[PDB]
């Protein structure tokens, strides 16, 4: 029955090692026979900000603007922007979303962020019933692909920056997990900047590999004790 | 001595409950002789996105565009775009940065993102090595006041969303004291739109309350153990 994938892709630079990764998991899942569709936010310089524009024609309430009713109410009537509605369709017909990008102050870079909060509307990604596991995207697998400047030793729960999970937390669960998706293991790419050459072509490698039998694998729990627990 | 405060400030709507906060703490700021500025960044239609208009300057390296190298030398060399470096002269000057947003995904929204990943670049606000407790920062303090959809109960680690202070730490560790501020406990005022109106207007006041007596206030100890116990 095929599979589609959509791969949300932040980097601004195309020979860089996010672009390496992403380009990756093109060759390999196009190789499969997957569906592959790229949103490359910066090429497509993405709107980040969450404003008014964001609603065609008339607001619901033009006296005082709440971005999140008047989303939901235009999600509702077909009159979102269309670069919102472009997403929502690739989301909506994809089996598996793949975020491609470095770690920007332990999260997402800040127009990745604006995917989120804008493409993720009520209605869409999620509303009163239909969260969490019971979201509006269930059935779909997601899964943060990231690249960091702190080496993998800087990231254990006793260091510096304390553990990966611990970061993972408002994007795995707050926002992946909230709007239905199961959520398959991140792909951390520990400092490829300090190299080396060989180590750098070794972990684009391990991806690839991994993406081979991305579709066997199971979800994490996505729960608290998954991320800071024992 | 006396003392200069930077409010940056993440919502479209100046009626809004985010709104108030901002202009009480505007209001009782200002009624204690505190020098005050406010940095409106929907209003000032502020650019969240990292890209290469960041800089003016010859690029470091022009074939391979690093963000994070290319900001950093621009730092020096005084080439970057004037937008960010307006914003590092308030937060020089500033002794307390408050931050006052809704919660958007269990983080700022991508505006306010993207006031973090440009303007508080290398050189400026940390440096390797010159971070946590050796942040360039340093001496300054720094508060989150954040707005929630979620109800207290909602946000404890027995509820839904698990506790609060697990979504503060990619915010006040790895952003804020990264760059060596000392943190301030987060106000959080809940839930706002299910709340009475007696109910809003008393988050107003303890807000207001609070303020009164900011300068006497001890940083939490910013570490794991506050954020995730226990
Ligand atoms: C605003 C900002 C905030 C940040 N916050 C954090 C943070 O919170 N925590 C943290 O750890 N880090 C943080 N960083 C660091 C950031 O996460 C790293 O800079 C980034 O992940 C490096 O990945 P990259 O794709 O840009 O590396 P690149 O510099 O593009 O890649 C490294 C090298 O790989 C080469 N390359 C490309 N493809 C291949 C290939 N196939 N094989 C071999 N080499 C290849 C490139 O040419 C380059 O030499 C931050 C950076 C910025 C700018
Ligand atoms: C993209 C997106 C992502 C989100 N993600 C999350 C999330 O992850 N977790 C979560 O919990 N929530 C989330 N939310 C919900 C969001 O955090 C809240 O809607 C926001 O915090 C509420 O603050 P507000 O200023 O917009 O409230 P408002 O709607 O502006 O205010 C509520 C009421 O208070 C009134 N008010 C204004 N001033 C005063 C005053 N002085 N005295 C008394 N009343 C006053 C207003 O008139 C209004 O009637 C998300 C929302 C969006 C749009
Ligand atoms: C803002 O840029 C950041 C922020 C960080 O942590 C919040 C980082 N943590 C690390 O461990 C290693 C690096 C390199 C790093 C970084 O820049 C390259
Ligand atoms: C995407 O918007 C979100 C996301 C959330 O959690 C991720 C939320 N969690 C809550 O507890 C309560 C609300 C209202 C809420 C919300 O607004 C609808
Ligand atoms: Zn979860
Ligand atoms: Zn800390």
Redesign the pocket.
């Given at each position: 029955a095929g599979k589609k994938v959509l791969i949300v892709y932040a980097?601004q630079?195309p020979?860089?090692?996010?672009?390496?990764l992403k380009n990756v998991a093109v060759d390999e899942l196009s190789r499969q026979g997957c569906t592959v569709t790229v949103s490359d936010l910066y090429a497509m310089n993405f709107e980040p900000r969450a404003t008014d524009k964001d609603i065609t024609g008339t607001l619901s309430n033009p006296e005082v603007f709440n971005y999140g009713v008047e989303t939901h109410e235009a999600y509702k009537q077909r009159s979102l922007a269309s670069d919102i509605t472009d997403e929502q369709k690739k989301v909506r017909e994809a089996d598996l979303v793949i975020f491609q990008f470095?770690?920007?102050?332990?999260?997402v870079?800040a127009i990745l962020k604006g995917w989120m909060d804008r493409v993720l509307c009520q209605g869409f990604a999620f509303d009163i019933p239909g969260f969490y596991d019971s979201g509006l995207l269930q059935g779909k697998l997601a899964l943060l692909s990231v690249?960091?400047?702190?080496t993998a030793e800087?990231y254990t729960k006793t260091g510096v920056?304390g553990d990966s999970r611990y970061f993972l937390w408002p994007l795995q669960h707050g926002t992946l997990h909230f709007c239905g998706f199961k959520v398959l293991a991140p792909q951390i790419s520990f400092?490829?900047?300090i190299?080396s050459?060989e180590e750098?072509?070794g972990m684009?490698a391990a991806w690839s590999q991994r993406l081979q039998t991305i579709w066997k694998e199971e979800p994490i729990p996505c729960t608290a004790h998954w991320h800071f627990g024992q």
């Amino acid at each position: 029955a095929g599979k589609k994938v959509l791969i949300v892709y932040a980097h601004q630079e195309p020979k860089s090692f996010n672009g390496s990764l992403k380009n990756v998991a093109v060759d390999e899942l196009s190789r499969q026979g997957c569906t592959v569709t790229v949103s490359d936010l910066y090429a497509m310089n993405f709107e980040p900000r969450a404003t008014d524009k964001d609603i065609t024609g008339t607001l619901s309430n033009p006296e005082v603007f709440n971005y999140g009713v008047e989303t939901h109410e235009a999600y509702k009537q077909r009159s979102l922007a269309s670069d919102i509605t472009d997403e929502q369709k690739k989301v909506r017909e994809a089996d598996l979303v793949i975020f491609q990008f470095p770690l920007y102050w332990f999260s997402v870079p800040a127009i990745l962020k604006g995917w989120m909060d804008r493409v993720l509307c009520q209605g869409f990604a999620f509303d009163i019933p239909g969260f969490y596991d019971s979201g509006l995207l269930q059935g779909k697998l997601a899964l943060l692909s990231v690249t960091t400047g702190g080496t993998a030793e800087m990231y254990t729960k006793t260091g510096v920056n304390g553990d990966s999970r611990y970061f993972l937390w408002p994007l795995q669960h707050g926002t992946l997990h909230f709007c239905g998706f199961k959520v398959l293991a991140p792909q951390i790419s520990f400092a490829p900047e300090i190299a080396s050459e060989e180590e750098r072509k070794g972990m684009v490698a391990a991806w690839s590999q991994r993406l081979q039998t991305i579709w066997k694998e199971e979800p994490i729990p996505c729960t608290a004790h998954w991320h800071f627990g024992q």
